[PDB]
Design an enzyme around this catalytic site. Structure first.
Site, short mmCIF file in Angstrom:
data_model
loop_
_atom_site.label_atom_id
_atom_site.label_comp_id
_atom_site.label_asym_id
_atom_site.label_seq_id
_atom_site.Cartn_x
_atom_site.Cartn_y
_atom_site.Cartn_z
N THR E 1 9.18 0.94 -7.41
CA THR E 1 8.55 2.40 -6.78
C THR E 1 7.61 2.90 -7.91
OG1 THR E 1 10.58 2.87 -5.42
CG2 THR E 1 8.98 4.71 -6.13
N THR E 2 6.37 3.47 -7.46
CA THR E 2 5.51 4.57 -8.07
C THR E 2 4.95 5.41 -7.35
OG1 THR E 2 4.92 2.39 -9.39
CG2 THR E 2 3.42 4.51 -9.63
N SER E 130 9.48 2.93 -11.35
CA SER E 130 9.44 2.00 -12.56
C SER E 130 8.11 1.77 -12.91
CB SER E 130 10.06 0.80 -11.76
OG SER E 130 9.51 0.41 -10.63
N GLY E 169 8.38 -3.71 -9.42
CA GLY E 169 9.19 -3.01 -8.40
C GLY E 169 8.39 -2.14 -7.52
#
Ligand SMILES: O=C(NCc1nc(-c2ccc(C(F)(F)F)cc2)cs1)[C@H]1CCCN(C(=O)CO[C@H]2CCCNC2)C1
Lengths: 232, 195, 213, 230, 211, 233, 242, 206, 230
Positions: E1-2, E130, E169
């Site tokens: 995830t970002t 992440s 991720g």
């Protein structure tokens, strides 16, 4: 004094709800009208003083984005009921991700009323009459609830001091097929006839929920001015 | 990781802290404002430790002391404030501890300028000088060396400059930005020192 | 030794949407470790005439969850006087699953349906209630085998020459091929598969035998 | 009797509980409801209360379960509480087990719920009478009362002006067992009409029976039946 | 995830990827990681998707009740405080949330970072997940307050791209929303980041790019 | 009466306990609150025995929190406990929201507590009326008057307590919307001195601004009392 | 003034509410239990329902049982008696859970007596308005019949009647010793006593207003309601006699 | 190891018509960092009752507050000073009330029992209120072994106030010089029935 | 119950033409110690329902007491033979008990078989029930017969034959190979005896001393226990 809150009369009527039905007769007069285009709720605001902030006392409220309501009787009890209705409507929206039916909101409101009976906490009846209007999947509709817990759907209805004359005029002049503009005209004419005033802006409060956005809309000075200029 | 420093003289008290907000390996901010909690009536609670625990405990103490002062219409004494803070920190110690380190500063007419050092175990005592965090290990002796009872406020700020320069030079976390509360002459002043 | 309260009973549930239909195919094998309890244990439960739920994981949790969702849907129908569509049931399932966030149902779920606008819809759910809509999904032991197949057929991301024109019969045959591949490569998937097709006329069930080894 | 009707736990010198009697008295002011059965079906009919010209009729009959429905007479809030209790019991039985609840057990649980409110001074009897229609291996009609009693009937009616309906049922009871469904619906509607015209708006009408879940009769079919009655 | 958000001259940019994974397996690439808390507040998701989704919906419910009672739009500060207190009450029960709440209220444009540990940090630039460090590096390299809307959107897209390029991720599609004084706009509703590599990094497409 | 219903409906539909609470309010000292552009003035009657009673001890003008203040009329002990509950709620809001309590929220909460005490078993109604002056979230100033029943309303200028009607009809004929500070305290003083004896020891007047609530020094009250003596002759 | 609460003694040392409960019970439907040579026979005459014609045939039954070997019936209000019978079944369940054998009859009678008596102590509880007969029969111990009064008193009988017309039923039952008469012969006597005692009862409503049950040798000393084939010749012979 | 966090030690000794209590003044942190040098571990309950609390500083303060509360309530209710033996039994009961979550403290009680005759009274505790009364001396803290050795070697029965002061001070200082985590000043209180002498020793600061 | 101490071994239940045949050896082992060798492990619930267990004896006895009182309370409320609870009702009840206890991390260390006859249309044994005292067998359709399994985790299902414990490998292989519908009593007995023979040779906790129980139109019959022939 001597009878408990849960005492039955010899006729089979609870004393306290019978007494609370006298409180709803007091207050300012309001009218609700349901037509295919939507539901309108109109109300008179008996402003006691020039020093009172006129917008601070609200006779028409929004239980939800799609639900409006007019109250009569004891105003503090009415605000308690409407706050509970707002909380439970938002709870329904969170749990189900949809707008609540008007009947379900009316039913849970009337369930909070008569909570003092303790059949399964409030101490007494609420002494409040509400005209709850709204727009759900089955279109616009208008309901009436009272301290006895009975809910009744109405095409048009009135509450408050001039309930009798208002319902007489509504019974005479209402038709199932009239348009939204005619419904506004009917509501303001009934309020004109039952009022003891010249029916200016900042003398009535108007709200409506239509079947185009299903959104509560509180009117402003331009809208009452328009409808008043349209009145015959 | 949150370096806190406090120094009390006869005519002042001064508190100081790094202004870094840490989240794992990244500095969220170089101008953090979740450490100082200024209370009404010449009182300050400087908190270290976890940011969430800092926010919860600092606002809890602030809202309790304000409630006291409005209910009673008086300014709470600094000693009462410090021991109330210690009592509440110790109450939660055996039930969901607040992992926060505390310097409690204030001024009273009853007791003058006051500084209290208090750790995450609620071990508290009044001190003329104190420090918290790993950086305490690198500043405390400086506070021991250059302190004297009749310090002026400017001399105390020079001592804090020595502490900040040593924290830059020697400490693993090269802490550069600092905020300072100066309580003296019935006024509370905020200062910001880089390097 | 402390008793571990979770067991995986195995088996796959595959879901595939159309424009105005949705297919949900689930295998019926019930297993414990390398043994078979029974060769017929349905994983798909009817919720409303345009909505079903399939699940994979612990069979006791799956059965209790499906009965709970059915009970709450009947309560909804009695109280509010209208059958909830798939989105309402989806939020309801999310709330129910999150209500046991710290001791979750040992089940991954696919809620399949046709909404009010005659659109096929799938929602996929992990144990704790995080969920999202999808055009194709798979849960259970063989899901890592079948999700790449569904990705390649449906989306065709890595194909310059794209044939994205599908109808219901080809989708049914493709779902049969997918569950056949899962049966071939997954030990826990086999015996028989029940394929539910939801479209305008409603729900229709069909059976396909699979390998029993 | 003014001394002994003040609290619900007081027996009069004649051994009467006057508050429970008043809760029963609340039931006679409700609109009339009638229920009859044949070998296969139970047909429930009712008069919907209409309080003014602009009102809609008050709902009279309610679905409890796929083969269980009710009608009420008395205070409608008490009826709503009992309705929710019955629906929850039915759905809980369908949840825990995979079968329909026993109708006798459900009616006994409702009667226990009635009785438990008659024991304590901080409670009042439910001021409502329920007629419960179901098909559980056979058509069945039950009645509950505020005093915690219950009974089973071949034919039942109560509410305002229900005496004429009772007289019609007394005359015509022997026919109902061999009547077909259409004749049964006609008989129930005639028994309701004796209490009064009837209208599609003001007439609730439902059927339950063998291979026939609880179903309100549609407005067009109800129009046909009302035309046949007249 | 970002996820990332930053304040700029014409309001706030929010940006996210769309990947959800279970360990090494990619469970989905169509996840909606930006939630409309109300008409003026957006909230991001990082970490536990269940907890983020549920508690942001719960926050939306609380905000709806507050607005209906008071006839007023809530501030971003008050919503962030409510969320932080709710998440702190479940300290020790393993909630995993990293959320950026950004919006417009009567006190202007505001942005807060809140996580499961009771954290609540006011700022003008945040990133979570992440791939947060990569987005931080790109933004801090190129961030300026006086960026135009197109420049700010392009910068957010580039930061999300580089985070997805480096982080396993993060991936799928980049979404970029713009919060202004009268609601928000989905400037980039969703853009597959497969195209962004062969736009930014390997435009010639004649050989495998060498990191 | 651990949970007995004390407030119940009379045969005419009234709640007699609330009416008796209103009677208790009518016996209390008079309070007046007047609004202006960005400030308010609150004046309260006080009666003390000269030479024996400490005048500082009885505070009828009270600072609820950072930015809100309260006058009341009725039973003093009921006022004390409700005011302390309101202060607790102010700091609870400022804990839960990280912004100070708006005046409309505080007035709504006080009305809610009064209504709750009219509608719970085993509790008497609060025998007080209150005037709550403060600032909204948008920094507009407001005055909210609340009754024992739980009804509330916002007012430009209002009076509560004994002989409140005469002060109300006076304020109707003398309130002039936005006013300077000095004329505003003058209006409040003459309005309360319509019913109250004309002396400086019989009134306490304070002015609420954004920064704080400031009590007017007794010299100004003495001078304005002399002016009011002059205009009446 | 002293008769407005069960928890107040009157100057002459009496609790008038319990006496009013006795008056309520004595007006209610008749119940009787009778020990016989080979069993106990229980009979409930529901004469009050002679008016209600649409009640289902033999639906109303006041005879219940515990453990399939104890008969329990009552005279009084149905709901209160259902409460008492539920308590009896709960006591039997708890006793078997604790001890893995069925509750002795006298222990159950004592516990139900205490349960009835506890509601006559406090100002806020309505005392139960029902007299409760509890009976059983065994091959070795013969019959044990108990009657629990609304005041908590429990007394053992060879035969007992409660409810309306109980004096006439007792007088007719006392005419002969039933411990040397079988239950099958006793049914005819019970029908004759009903026809002679209760004026509402007649030949045309004996078959649908009277509940019968017994525990004897023919039922393997377990609960059963009399089949129509045994009842019909007995009531026919009673009608022909009368 | 919990007692090593702050360190600290308290001592008490008896003489003829006189008694003495003494303690170190360090507040340490993490067993090695000295953070205060005035943290007195002796607390006055009343003129004939003193308590020396060694152990964790938070529990020292909490227990002192509880004891002050209880003693003040007792004395205001009875309008008389609390007996030292009554206080000692009360301290035992308070420590045992928290048996499964104890205050990490090792108190001593030093005072005069009144009979007017002033008899010295000394007793030492564990953390759950197990108390031992002594006629000669009492010790608690992390420096207990060194204090036991010094008092065993140097205690002289029925010393006057000056001899008692010198003996208890030398015992405390010699014991503290062999302990890393205690010292940094030494407080010595000497009670006689007419007065109290409070002294601060010129102690090591290592 | 932290874990098993006194354990019962396998149980085998099958459908055959006249009803259910359920078998279990009469051994309860204390670890490797064959302490008890005349234990009953098949319990009668009612005239058309029996329960068998493998695993801990104390938990099984507790469950047996629960089902005993459930049957007694069912009898107390009964008015016709259709009101008697079916084997699937008891299977659902046992599954719910195991599920709730699994949720509490307090499991019953058992695998349970609930078997019997669902239909009341084959006999009148329930019209007059005898708890304390005990023509040809009627052919019963397999749809009217019920056999249901439950485990520690509450995993519950039904089939034409069920095995527990070591029978899940040894007996169940032969059952899946050789089972056929509408077997006679002799064929069912021979198949069960073969399965128990293999278990006796390969299950160390097994005994050759068998208890057979038959649920048929004439109720539950406990056969005289026997040593395995040959
Ligand atoms: O990802 C998979 N399918 C697609 C799914 N996407 C989701 C989902 C994705 C995104 C979101 C959100 F973030 F957007 F909200 C919410 C939900 C759930 S499912 C499978 C990949 C292998 C693992 N897997 C299994 O089912 C394995 O079997 C389980 C059964 C029960 C427990 N023991 C093992 C799931």
């Amino acid at each position: 004094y001597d009878r408990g809150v849960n005492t039955f009369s010899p006729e089979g009527r609870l004393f306290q709800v019978e007494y609370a039905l006298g409180a709803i007769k007091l207050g300012s007069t309001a009218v609700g009208i349901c037509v295919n285009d939507g539901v309108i709720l109109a109300s008179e605001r008996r402003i006691s003083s020039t020093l009172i902030e006129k917008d601070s006392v609200e006779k028409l409220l929004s239980i939800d984005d799609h639900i409006g309501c007019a109250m009569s009787g004891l105003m503090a009890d009415a605000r308690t009921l409407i706050d509970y209705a707002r909380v439970e409507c938002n709870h329904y929206k969170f749990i189900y991700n949809e707008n609540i039916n008007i009947k379900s909101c009316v039913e849970l409101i009337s369930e909070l009323a008569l909570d003092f009976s303790n059949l399964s906490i409030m101490s007494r009846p609420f002494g409040v009459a509400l005209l709850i209007g709204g727009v759900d999947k089955n279109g616009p509709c208008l309901w009436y609830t009272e301290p006895s817990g009975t809910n009744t759907r109405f095409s048009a209805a009135s509450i408050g001091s001039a309930q009798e004359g208002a319902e007489l005029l509504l019974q005479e002049n209402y038709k199932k097929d009239m348009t939204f503009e005619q419904a506004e005209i009917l509501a303001l004419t009934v309020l004109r006839q039952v009022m003891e005033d010249k029916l200016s802006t900042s003398n009535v409060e108007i709200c409506a929920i239509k079947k185009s956005d299903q959104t509560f809309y509180k009117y402003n000075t331009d809208d009452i001015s328009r409808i008043i200029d349209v009145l015959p | 990781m949150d370096t806190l420093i406090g120094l009390r003289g006869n005519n002042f008290v001064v508190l100081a802290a790094d202004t870094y907000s840490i989240n794992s390996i990244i500095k969220l901010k170089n101008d953090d404002n979740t450490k100082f909690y200024d209370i009404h009536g010449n009182k300050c609670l400087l908190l270290g430790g976890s940011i969430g625990d800092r926010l919860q405990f600092g606002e809890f103490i602030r809202k309790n002391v304000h409630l006291y002062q409005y209910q009673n219409n008086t300014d709470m004494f600094v000693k009462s404030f410090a021991f109330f803070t210690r009592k509440n920190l110790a109450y939660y110690l055996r039930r969901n501890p607040f992992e926060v380190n505390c310097l409690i500063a204030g001024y009273d007419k009853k007791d003058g300028y006051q500084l209290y050092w208090c750790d995450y175990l609620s071990n508290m005592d009044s001190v003329n000088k104190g420090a918290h965090g790993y950086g305490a290990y690198l500043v405390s002796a400086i506070l021991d060396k250059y302190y004297h009872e009749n310090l002026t406020v400017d001399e105390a700020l020079d001592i804090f400059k020595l502490c900040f320069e040593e924290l830059k030079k020697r400490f693993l976390l090269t802490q550069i930005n600092y905020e300072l509360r100066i309580m003296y002459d019935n006024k509370v002043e905020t200062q910001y020192v880089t390097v | 030794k402390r008793w571990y309260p979770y067991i995986d009973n195995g088996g796959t549930v595959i879901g595939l949407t159309g424009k105005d239909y949705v297919i949900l195919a689930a295998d019926t094998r019930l297993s414990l470790s390398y043994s078979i309890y029974t060769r017929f244990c349905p994983k798909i439960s009817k919720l409303t005439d345009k909505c079903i739920i399939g699940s994979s994981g612990m069979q006791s949790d799956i059965k209790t969850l499906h009965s709970l969702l059915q009970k709450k849907i009947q309560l909804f129908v009695l109280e509010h006087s209208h059958y909830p569509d798939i989105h309402v049931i989806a939020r309801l399932l999310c709330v129910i699953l999150y209500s046991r966030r710290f001791f979750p149902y040992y089940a991954f779920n696919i809620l399949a349906g046709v909404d009010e606008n005659n659109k096929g819809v799938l929602y996929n759910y992990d144990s704790v209630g995080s969920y999202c809509e999808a055009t194709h999904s798979c849960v259970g032991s063989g899901s890592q085998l079948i999700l790449p197949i569904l990705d390649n057929r449906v989306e065709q991301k890595n194909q310059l020459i794209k044939n994205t024109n599908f109808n219901l019969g080809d989708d049914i045959n493709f779902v049969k091929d997918a569950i056949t591949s899962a049966t071939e490569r997954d030990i826990y998937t086999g015996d028989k598969t029940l394929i539910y097709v939801i479209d305008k006329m409603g729900i229709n069930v069909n059976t396909l035998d699979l390998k029993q080894d | 009797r003014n001394l002994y009707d003040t609290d619900n736990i007081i027996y009069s010198p004649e051994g009467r509980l006057y508050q429970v009697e008043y809760a029963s008295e609340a039931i006679k002011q409700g609109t009339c409801a009638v229920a009859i059965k044949s070998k296969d079906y139970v047909v429930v009919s009712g008069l919907k209360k209409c309080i003014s010209k602009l009102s809609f009729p008050q709902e009279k009959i309610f679905k409890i379960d796929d083969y269980i429905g009710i009608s009420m007479s008395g205070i409608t809030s008490d009826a709503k509480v009992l309705t929710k209790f019955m629906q929850n019991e039915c759905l809980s039985h369908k949840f825990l087990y995979n079968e329909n609840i026993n109708i006798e057990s459900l009616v006994r649980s409702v009667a226990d719920k009635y009785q438990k409110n008659t024991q304590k001074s901080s409670k009042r009897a439910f001021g409502v009478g329920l007629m419960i229609a179901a098909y559980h291996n056979e058509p069945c009609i039950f009645e509950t009362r505020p005093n915690g009693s219950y009974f089973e009937y071949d034919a039942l009616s109560f509410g305002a002006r229900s005496h004429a309906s009772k007289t019609y049922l007394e005359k015509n009871l022997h026919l109902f067992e061999e009547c077909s469904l259409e004749e049964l619906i006609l008989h129930c509607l005639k028994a309701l009409k004796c209490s009064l015209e009837l209208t599609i708006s003001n007439t609730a009408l439902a059927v339950v029976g063998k291979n026939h879940p609880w179903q309100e009769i549609s407005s067009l079919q109800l129009e046909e039946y009302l035309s046949k009655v007249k | 995830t970002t996820t990332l958000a930053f304040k700029f001259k014409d309001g706030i940019i929010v940006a996210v990827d769309s990947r959800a994974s279970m360990g090494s397996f990619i469970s989905s690439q169509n996840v909606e990681k930006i939630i409309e808390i109300n008409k003026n507040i957006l909230g991001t998701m990082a970490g536990g998707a269940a907890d983020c989704l549920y508690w942001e919906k719960y926050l939306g419910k609380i905000i709806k009740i507050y607005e209906l009672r008071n006839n007023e739009k809530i501030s971003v500060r008050a919503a962030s405080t409510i969320l932080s207190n709710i998440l702190y009450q479940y300290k020790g029960y393993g909630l995993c949330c990293g959320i950026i709440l950004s919006g417009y209220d009567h006190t202007g444009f505001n942005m807060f970072y809140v996580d499961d540990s009771g954290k609540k940090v006011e700022g003008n630039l945040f990133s979570c997940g992440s791939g947060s460090t990569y987005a931080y590096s790109i933004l801090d390299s190129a961030y300026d307050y006086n960026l135009n809307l197109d420049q700010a959107v392009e910068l957010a897209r580039n930061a999300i791209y580089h985070a997805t390029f480096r982080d396993g991720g993060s991936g799928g599609k980049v979404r970029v929303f713009h919060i202004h004084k009268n609601g928000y706009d989905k400037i980039i509703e969703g853009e597959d980041v497969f195209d962004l590599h062969y736009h930014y990094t390997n435009p010639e497409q004649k050989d495998q790019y060498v990191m | 009466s651990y949970d007995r219903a004390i407030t119940v409906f009379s045969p005419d539909g009234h709640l007699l306990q609330v009416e008796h609470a209103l009677e208790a309010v009518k016996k209390g000292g008079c309070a007046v609150a007047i609004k202006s552009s960005n400030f308010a003035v609150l004046a309260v009657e006080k009666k003390n025995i000269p030479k024996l009673q400490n005048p500082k001890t009885t505070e009828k003008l009270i600072k609820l929190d950072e930015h809100n203040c309260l006058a009341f009329a009725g039973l003093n002990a009921d006022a004390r406990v409700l005011v302390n509950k309101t202060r607790l709620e102010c700091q609870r809001y400022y804990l839960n929201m990280d912004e100070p309590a708006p005046v409309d929220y505080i007035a709504k909460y006080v009305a809610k507590v009064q209504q709750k005490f009219t509608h719970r078993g085993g509790v008497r109604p609060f025998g007080i009326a209150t005037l709550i002056a403060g600032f909204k979230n948008n920094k507009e100033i407001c005055i909210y008057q609340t009754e024992p029943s739980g009804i509330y309303a916002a007012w430009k200028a209002q009076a509560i307590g004994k002989n409140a009607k005469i002060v109300q009809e006076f304020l109707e004929k003398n309130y002039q919307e936005n006013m300077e500070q000095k004329d505003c305290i003058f209006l409040a003083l003459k309005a309360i001195f319509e019913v109250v004896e004309l002396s400086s020891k019989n009134v306490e007047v304070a002015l609420l601004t954004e920064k704080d609530l400031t009590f007017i020094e007794e010299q100004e009250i003495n001078s304005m009392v002399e002016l009011i003596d002059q205009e009446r002759t | 003034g002293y008769d407005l609460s069960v928890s107040t003694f009157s100057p002459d040392g009496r609790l008038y509410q319990v006496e009013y409960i006795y008056k309520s019970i004595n007006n209610n439907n008749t119940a009787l239990c009778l020990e016989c040579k080979d069993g106990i026979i229980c009979c409930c005459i529901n004469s009050n329902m002679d008016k209600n014609k649409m009640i289902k045939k033999n639906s109303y039954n006041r005879i219940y049982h515990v453990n399939n070997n104890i008969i329990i019936t009552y005279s009084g209000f149905d709901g209160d008696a259902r409460n008492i019978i539920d308590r009896a079944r709960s006591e039997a369940n708890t006793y078997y859970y604790n001890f893995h054998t069925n509750i002795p009859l006298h222990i159950l009678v004592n516990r139900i007596s205490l349960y009835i008596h506890a509601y006559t102590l406090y100002w806020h509880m309505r005392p139960f308005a029902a007299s409760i007969i509890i009976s059983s029969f065994n091959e070795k111990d013969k019959g044990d019949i108990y009657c629990i009064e609304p005041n908590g008193a429990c007394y053992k009988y060879s035969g007992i009647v409660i409810g309306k017309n109980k004096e006439m039923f007792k007088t007719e039952i006392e005419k002969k010793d039933y411990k040397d008469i079988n239950v099958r012969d006793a049914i005819e006597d019970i029908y004759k006593f009903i026809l002679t005692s209760d004026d509402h009862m007649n030949k045309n409503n004996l078959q649908n207003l009277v509940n019968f049950s017994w525990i004897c040798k023919e039922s393997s000393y377990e609960f059963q309601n009399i089949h129509e084939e045994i009842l019909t010749p007995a009531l026919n012979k009673a009608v022909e006699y009368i | 190891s919990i007692y090593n966090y702050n360190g600290g030690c308290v001592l008490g000794m008896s003489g003829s018509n006189c008694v003495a209590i003494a303690c170190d003044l360090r507040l340490g942190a993490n067993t090695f960092t000295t953070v205060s040098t005035k943290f007195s571990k002796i607390f006055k309950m009343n003129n004939n009752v003193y308590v020396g609390l060694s152990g964790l500083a938070t529990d020292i303060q909490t227990l002192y507050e509880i004891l002050r509360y209880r003693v003040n309530l007792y004395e205001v209710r009875q309008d008389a000073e609390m007996d030292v033996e009554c206080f000692a039994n009360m301290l035992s009961s308070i420590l045992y009330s928290n048996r499964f979550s104890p205050y990490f403290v090792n108190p001593i009680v030093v005072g005069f029992k009144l009979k007017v005759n002033y008899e010295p009274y000394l007793t030492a505790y564990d953390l759950i209120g197990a108390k031992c009364e002594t006629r000669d001396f009492v010790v608690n803290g992390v420096t207990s072994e060194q204090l036991f050795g010094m008092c065993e070697s140097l205690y002289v029965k029925d010393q006057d106030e000056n001899g008692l002061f010198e003996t208890i001070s030398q015992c405390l200082l010699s014991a503290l010089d062999r302990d890393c985590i205690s010292g940094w000043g030494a407080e010595v209180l000497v009670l006689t029935p007419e007065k109290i002498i409070k002294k601060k020793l010129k102690a090591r600061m290592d | 119950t932290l874990g098993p101490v006194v354990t019962g071994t396998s149980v085998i239940a099958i459908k055959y033409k006249h009803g259910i045949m359920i078998a279990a050896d009469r051994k309860a082992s204390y670890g490797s110690y064959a302490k008890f060798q005349n234990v009953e492990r098949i319990f009668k619930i009612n005239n058309k329902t029996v329960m068998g267990f493998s695993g801990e004896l104390a938990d099984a006895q507790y469950l047996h007491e629960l089902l005993t009182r459930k049957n007694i309370n069912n009898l107390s409320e009964k008015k016709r033979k259709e009101d008697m609870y079916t084997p699937q009702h008891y299977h659902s009840y046992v599954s719910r008990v195991f599920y709730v206890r699994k949720n509490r991390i307090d499991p019953l260390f058992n695998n349970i078989i609930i078997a019997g006859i669902n239909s009341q249309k084959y006999d009148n044994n329930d019209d007059n029930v005898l708890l304390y005292t005990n023509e040809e067998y009627k052919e019963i359709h397999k749809d009217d017969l019920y056999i249901g399994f439950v485990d520690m985790h509450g995993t519950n299902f039904c089939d034409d034959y069920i095995t527990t414990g070591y029978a899940r490998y040894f007996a169940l292989t032969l059952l899946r190979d050789h089972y056929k519908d509408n077997m006679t009593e002799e064929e069912a007995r021979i198949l069960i005896n073969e399965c128990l023979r293999i278990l006796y040779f390969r299950d160390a906790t097994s005994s050759n001393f068998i208890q057979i129980v038959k649920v048929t139109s004439k109720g539950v019959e406990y056969e005289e226990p026997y040593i395995l022939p040959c």
